[PDB]
């Protein structure tokens, strides 16, 4: 299972932003990564936001799971 | 909070300083490159005098 | 690098690894529900003493 | 592993003074004991 | 006789010195070791600055 | 109690403004370095071919 998780980061990193393979990241898949937010993080050209801001968006929702048991707070219903 | 007992993190910090000494060790330096800028010239410069003594 | 200017410059290639670790692990934790290892007092007493007594 | 010979020239250079975690180790062992001692007397 | 041939090797080694400089880079983004012939590297603690 | 979730995501939107100037800096970064490499391939040929 080690060659399974190692081929997740390697494949993802090349595809997400940058690597005849180095200039493939020069156009970048940042145009593919762009459409998720709205438009606004446009500065990803050489300081690439959507390359980095996906890992940090993954590390937040991964740490939302551990905190969920402690801060329950929910009634016998749904929100506002 | 005032946490306790300490048998945790500190053994997992020195494994990290096998990582950071692996990445940052492979860093190209402009200054280092600059220091390889004059090593090619003056060997060929005296090589011009190597044919100046081979003739004269 | 500029202050030391000795043959104690060998030590300085490590000190830039020390700045990237707690430069990052203090900047990650500003996120919504993340956790910083330099919050706990345990590892910082293992970052001071193996470095401070490496000097004397 | 090859996480050694890339940085093996570095180690025996500065681990002569840098690998003195004995003091750190000694402090850690003592710290664990005092915590246990206070929880023994509660 | 000798000085036209001792300059000829100095012409021949200079003809080999430029053709090895064309060997190093096939592209701007070419290589991290083929550029490690002209610009130098050394042993531990050479580059002071 | 995570209305401070938005304000740590709101400040990271204002830095995307200056990130479009970070690109120029990024583009500029190593231009000198690549040029720093163009000077050695240019000097070594021309200084030798006339000497031959």
């Amino acid at each position: 299972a080690s060659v399974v998780p190692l081929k997740d980061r390697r494949l993802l990193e090349v595809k997400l932003g940058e690597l005849d393979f180095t200039p493939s990241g020069i156009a970048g898949a940042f145009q593919r990564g762009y459409y998720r937010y709205y438009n606004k993080y446009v500065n990803v050209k050489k300081g690439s936001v959507a390359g980095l801001s996906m890992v940090l968006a993954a590390y937040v929702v991964f740490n939302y799971c551990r905190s969920y048991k402690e801060l329950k707070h929910e009634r016998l219903r749904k929100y506002h | 909070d005032t946490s306790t007992w300490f048998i945790t993190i500190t053994s997992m910090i020195m494994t990290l300083f096998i990582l950071f000494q692996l990445k940052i060790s492979n860093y190209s330096y402009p200054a280092s490159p600059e220091s390889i800028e004059l090593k090619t010239q003056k060997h060929s410069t005296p090589w011009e005098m190597k044919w100046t003594k081979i003739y004269l | 690098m500029a202050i030391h200017n000795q043959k104690g410059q060998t030590w300085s290639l490590m000190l830039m690894s020390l700045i990237m670790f707690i430069g990052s692990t203090n900047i990650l934790g500003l996120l919504p529900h993340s956790f910083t290892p330099t919050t706990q007092l345990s590892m910082n007493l293992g970052m001071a003493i193996p470095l401070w007594s490496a000097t004397v | 592993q090859f996480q050694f010979t890339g940085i093996k020239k570095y180690f025996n250079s500065y681990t002569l003074t840098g690998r003195m975690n004995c003091v750190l180790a000694t402090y850690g062992g003592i710290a664990l004991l005092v915590l246990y001692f206070k929880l023994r007397s509660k | 006789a000798e000085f036209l041939s001792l300059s000829k090797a100095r012409i021949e080694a200079y003809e080999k010195e430029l053709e090895k400089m064309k060997n190093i880079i096939p592209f701007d983004q070419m290589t991290i070791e083929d550029l490690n012939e002209v610009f130098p590297e050394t042993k531990l603690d050479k580059k002071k600055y | 109690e995570t209305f401070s979730a938005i304000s740590t995501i709101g400040v990271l939107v204002y830095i995307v403004k200056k990130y479009g100037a970070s690109i120029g800096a990024f583009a500029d970064k190593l231009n000198e370095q690549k040029i720093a490499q163009l000077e050695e391939v240019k000097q070594a040929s021309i200084k030798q071919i006339q000497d031959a």
Side-chain angles (χ1 to χ4, degrees), chain A residues 1 5 17 23 25 27-29 33 47-75 80, chain B residues 1-28 30-31 33 46, chain C residues 2-56, chain D residues 2-7 10-26 28-34 37-39 41, chain E residues 1 9 13 26 40, chain F residues 4-5 7 10-18 20-25 27-28 34-52:
Chain A
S48 292
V49 163
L52 188 78
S53 179
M54 272 165 185
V55 164
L56 258 69
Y59 176 72
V60 165
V61 76
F62 163 63
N63 284 327
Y64 177 60
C65 307
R66 328 269 70 80
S67 158
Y68 167 64
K69 175 180 171 314
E70 278 85 332
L71 40 75
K72 38 186 102 68
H73 192 273
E74 40 192 357
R75 291 177 296 273
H80 217 292
Chain B
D1 196 73
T2 80
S3 58
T4 45
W5 150 91
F6 296 172
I7 310 195
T8 171
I9 329 164
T10 79
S11 172
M12 288 74 83
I13 211 174
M14 203 57 209
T15 172
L16 202 72
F17 286 6
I18 313 153
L19 299 195
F20 270 95
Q21 292 165 72
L22 268 169
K23 308 194 151 199
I24 212 161
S25 45
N26 274 352
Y27 276 90
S28 69
Chain C
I3 279 180
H4 292 194
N5 197 241
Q6 289 143 183
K7 220 49 75 182
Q9 292 266 27
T10 306
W11 194 272
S12 186
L13 317 174
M14 188 259 254
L15 314 169
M16 294 302 292
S17 69
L18 173 53
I19 188 178
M20 295 303 286
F21 165 47
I22 40 185
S24 39
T25 43
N26 283 176
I27 207 72
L28 263 298
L30 274 300
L31 292 172
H33 298 139
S34 313
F35 175 70
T36 53
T38 81
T39 290
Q40 330 279 311
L41 190 141
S42 306
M43 50 186 252
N44 286 118
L45 269 295
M47 291 187 100
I49 319 180
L51 268 164
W52 168 91
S53 71
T55 58
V56 297
Chain D
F2 274 82
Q3 291 175 7
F4 175 77
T5 176
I7 54 184
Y10 273 52
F11 277 8
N12 41 13
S13 153
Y14 68 78
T15 50
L16 312 174
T17 82
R19 214 47 62 94
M20 286 297 115
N21 311 348
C22 171
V23 175
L24 154 60
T26 307
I30 298 183
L32 275 177
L33 290 175
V34 59
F37 261 57
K38 248 176 205 168
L39 299 200
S41 278
Chain F
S4 79
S7 302
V11 169
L12 255 174
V13 169
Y14 269 108
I15 302 305
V16 180
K17 171 258 298 174
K18 276 172 61 71
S22 301
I23 37 183
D28 281 12
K34 66 160 303 304
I35 270 41
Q37 53 107 31
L38 175 146
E39 71 92 31
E40 193 82 342
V41 67
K42 196 42 149 281
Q43 70 91 38
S45 45
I46 314 300
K47 80 180 274 290
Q48 261 286 16
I49 60 185
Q50 316 278 28
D51 212 40

